[PDB]
Subunit: 239 residues, 2 copies
């Protein structure tokens, strides 16, 4: 049957996890622990040769990329049209955001988690104060774009209802939130939007999906072995 | 009516250009000249507040992000099935590649062009032999992934027929090819793939869309004023 290789630490996994639970899509949970390097192992490379999460598997069908996984689940499980509307322009707005976040907001949030908490606390590697400040400055810029280019004065990023776009954006914004960054303080429109999204998702589910990312400042250091294999993996993931 | 703001210099514009020409879609072409910093004008910041190309405009509907544009044109004008296959699994592969390429092949092909030609020539900015070597090294890593994860032993990247994925891939690879880099050498399966893609697209149209990028090594160095405006944009674009 349907299997989902996830790790709620990972941003795209929370987006997929929330989408699957919210829509009651029956899947088998295969928790892949990234804090142990369980993704660089022989047992996981058989599943996904690229050694990454999220990963979907259903028989001989395998799929990577959360954007592909979400669209696939949307179509196969005939979820509500609001996730990805029939209307061509309304649907184009979801694609516009999904294509936009790869190199911008996803990149920012991920760098905020690693340059402010993961390297120093988890990897034990000090980060240049100049690199940390640049990372947070750039986080502010992408937050500003999120409001100016997408949210504007609407209830959600693509219209009056929640869509795949809102789902991917809030799991992205929870990265810096888990790192101690003041993401919504000083941004009333994004704070209003956050409450509308977790209300549409269901507080229990939203809270459940974000338990590991909020304990990020509490993970113990990684022993010399795991750290040696994750270092080049992380450095390549956050540029 | 349908308008397409493009510059054959940028990779995403070539994808949108070839898809619209090949499918006989009626549109007015608005050439945005990146070399003359026309995208940074106060009049183009009206069409797209981000000042980037490609940009689609059909009435009060404006759309950015090449992936969203390609998918939109695929629905608005109903084109051959192979671009974005109706088959659930074949379609997912297209989405998977379109999502994967943003932070990988798009970035490597773009950095290759700039460290090998655009910086030294067009911007009078020398690039250390190791910066170029690093960029060309990462390029192969992605060229390898392009074969191991997507192409493999198939005619095209997501099937026996060309899709939006192949169109985006070959327009991306034409950047390092326009830079005089080694791309299809030593890689016979990509070399074979290239000719199938050019033929599927049509050799004349493929040529036509790549006249600007194949003359990249001949662009006159931008004068101190234009260089000053573009310098931030460039480093922030090739991140």
């Amino acid at each position: 049957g349907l299997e989902l290789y996830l790790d709620l630490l990972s941003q795209p996994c929370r987006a997929v996890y929330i989408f699957a639970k919210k829509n009651d899509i029956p899947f088998e949970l295969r928790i892949v622990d990234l804090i142990k390097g369980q993704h660089l192992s022989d047992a996981f490379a058989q599943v996904n040769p690229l050694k990454k999460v999220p990963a979907l598997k259903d028989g001989d069908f395998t799929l990577t990329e959360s954007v592909a996984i979400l669209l696939y689940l949307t179509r196969k499980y005939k979820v509500p049209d609001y996730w990805y509307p029939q209307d061509l322009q309304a649907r184009a707005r979801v694609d516009e955001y999904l294509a936009w976040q790869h190199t911008t907001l996803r990149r920012s949030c991920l760098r905020a988690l690693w340059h402010k908490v993961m390297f120093p606390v988890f990897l034990g590697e000090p980060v240049s104060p100049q690199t940390l400040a640049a990372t947070l400055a750039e986080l502010d810029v992408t937050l500003q774009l999120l409001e100016d280019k997408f949210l504007q004065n609407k209830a959600f990023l693509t219209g009056p209802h929640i869509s795949l776009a809102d789902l991917v954006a809030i799991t992205e914004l929870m990265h810096p939130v888990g790192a101690g960054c003041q993401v919504f303080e000083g941004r009333p429109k994004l704070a209003t939007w956050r409450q509308r999204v977790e209300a549409a998702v269901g507080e229990d589910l939203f809270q459940e999906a974000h338990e590991v990312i909020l304990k990020a400042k509490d993970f113990p250091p990684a022993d010399p072995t795991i750290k040696q294999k994750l270092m080049p993996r992380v450095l390549a993931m956050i540029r």
